[model samples]
Target chain A: IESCMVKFELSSSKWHMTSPKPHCVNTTSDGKLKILQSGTYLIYGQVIPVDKKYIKDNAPFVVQIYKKNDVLQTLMNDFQILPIGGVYELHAGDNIYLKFNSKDHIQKNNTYWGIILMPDLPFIS
Target chain B: IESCMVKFELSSSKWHMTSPKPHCVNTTSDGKLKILQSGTYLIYGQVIPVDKKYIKDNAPFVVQIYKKNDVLQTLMNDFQILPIGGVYELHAGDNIYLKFNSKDHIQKNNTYWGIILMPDLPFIS
Candidate 1:
């Protein structure tokens, strides 16, 4: 698999990814990232979800990274703080992206999404 | 650098890490990890912190991972959810641990601390 790494920043309610030194991924219209190569990647991100205002004093909101319609992992959080990331084996042409259970609970500050493909990881015992 | 990987789980208000298969790290009395080999490792964890119940509605809490006394990364999260992790270059004999500003805010459930030494990373485009 080709070495692949990409990251996205949130601004004005949109997820935007800048071209890395050597670009190798694509973004879909619905905010999903298009994977161009198959390899293990460290996918990570944070979502700023404010308290849901309603009948409850606090509610659990979810922040998740998905591979197509299937969720890779989900983080249960309240209000504005929680980061979810993990190592995943991905295939070429796989579509991956971040998502929330309730879109309206999202706030517009201090959140980030990114990934890296380490070419040479430290040897482990 | 040699291979190294370790993980800790919260139990009864204490951080405990079992010996990894083919152990390569040590634990301190103060819940810090002792690095056996210097290498680039993926360090990550989630802290179950809750909202401060006092005059303020929501007070910010921090989940930090440290190398010796130096902070590697700090995560801002409210009660019960927030994961902070990053890739850092570590050295042998470095003492690392996780800490919260208010230890009273910590609850004992569903939180994990971990590190992985990856030997081969995908080549980045």
Candidate 2:
């Protein structure tokens, strides 16, 4: 099956959306996000089990970040049952995307994921 | 009831902490995060039910972001489970914090939350 790209369901919920930066940065909903500029980005994600019993015993929620065709990192594994996040250096034109999965089906209505480009780091030679 | 400011328990678990920026950005354990600079910050959060039964029946995990005493935003409400996050414009002197709660007690070990400042946006007229 083709990977399903996840999008932020704005009408479903709300957060501190003071600006449209999120909308601009994640302009695409096709999984592969286009990087507008190069800088350090603060990426975050979490996995919620549709069926807690399945998650607690049989399966685990997994979150991942893929840089282009390569796997950049795994945001969360099965046992790491909590919110997961971190920072990374990205370049403009770089294609990045997120992947959330569970061995069993996860409740799409409850499960969520997202990424944001952070401020630039100091120029250190 | 008074709000309980949340902090990222590093020893509790791990994600893609490639750099120490998360630690540096959020150096306080008491919850009042000190913003180092001003920019559009990408914030993220999630609420996991400690007792699935409780979450499904009696309670729902709620995530929030607060600017000092003023409530900035509600990241996630009860039914909006899964993971929640977004972007916001912040200033250098802004005092921002996070809060997570449930009508019932949530398993602190499994429940998690976090925030990250995204890349700065371009200057516009």
Candidate 3:
């Protein structure tokens, strides 16, 4: 019964970024987002595009991870292949919800993102 | 800049354990401790002992990771060598201070421990 490894550095914003960052980056305003996993998990996600209409062939987006509302993990169910931003590992728990459903779901008018989480340390039996 | 993977399940007590461990471990206290990291890091430490008095000789302990007063990383400064506890990854930050210095510093009188941390995902350029 042993396993304890943790890493959580998810910095994705639609407009800004901050946290040991004091120059640029620090823009995200879509409410309801809190992620923290301290064992038995593997979840990852990435999205960093803010201009040029963000082509993966026209507007398309869907990135989700939840433990409060269920939905363990996901990424573009109907968007085809387009997640070359980086970071994707998950199996969740702990009141976590980082949802971004855009395809003109409207995210501040201009959009860009960043996220990656791998939590492995929750085994004792 | 993105890199986030987290797992922290430290359970090693001088006497026993419990935590989601309805039946075993959940014990530790040597004084002045706090560990948490979330970006630009490369520091790790491990120590799990209680029973056999920990062979490598008799007593051996030293695992540190701090970022409030600085002292990024360190493992066993003295006391010969013995750290096969697992999980040694860190680069320090976020008001973390997990100091376990014992060769004679004394922990719970009988002594034992456990810890690991890896944090990366803080770059925006």
Which candidate number would show the highest DockQ if scored against the true structure? 1
Which regions of candidate 3 are displaced past 4 Å? A1-12, A15-115, A119-125, B1-8, B13-39, B42-96, B99-125
Using TM-score as the measure, what is the rank order of every candidate, best first?
A: 1, 2, 3
Residue-wise C-alpha lDDT for candidate 3, range B1-111, written one tens digit per residue? 222222233433222212333111122343222334432322222233344444346454455655567765454423322222222243333344456565343223322
Q: Is the docking of candidate 2 incorrect, acceptable, medium or high quality?
A: incorrect
Better of 2 and 3 by DockQ: 2
Per-residue lDDT value at B88 in model 1: 63
Candidate 3 lDDT over A1-125, as tens digits, reads: 12222223233332222344322112224423343433333222233334434444444455565656677545442332222122223333345545666533333322223332333333432
Give the worst 10-residue stretch by lDDT in candidate 2 chain A.
A1-10
i-RMSD of all predictions = 8.5, 12.1, 16.4
Per-residue accuracy of model 1 over B3-61 as CA lDDT, tens digit each:
44454556533433323332556665455677777776567666766545641544457
Highest lDDT scorer: 1
Looking at model 3, residue A114 earns an lDDT score of 31
Task: Write one digit per residue (lDDT tens) for candidate 2, span B1-125.
Answer: 11111235333543333243543244455434666556655455444545454455544356567866777655433342344344457776677766667535445454444545443333211
lDDT of all the models against the reference? 0.60, 0.48, 0.35
Please, what is the TM-score per model?
0.54, 0.43, 0.22
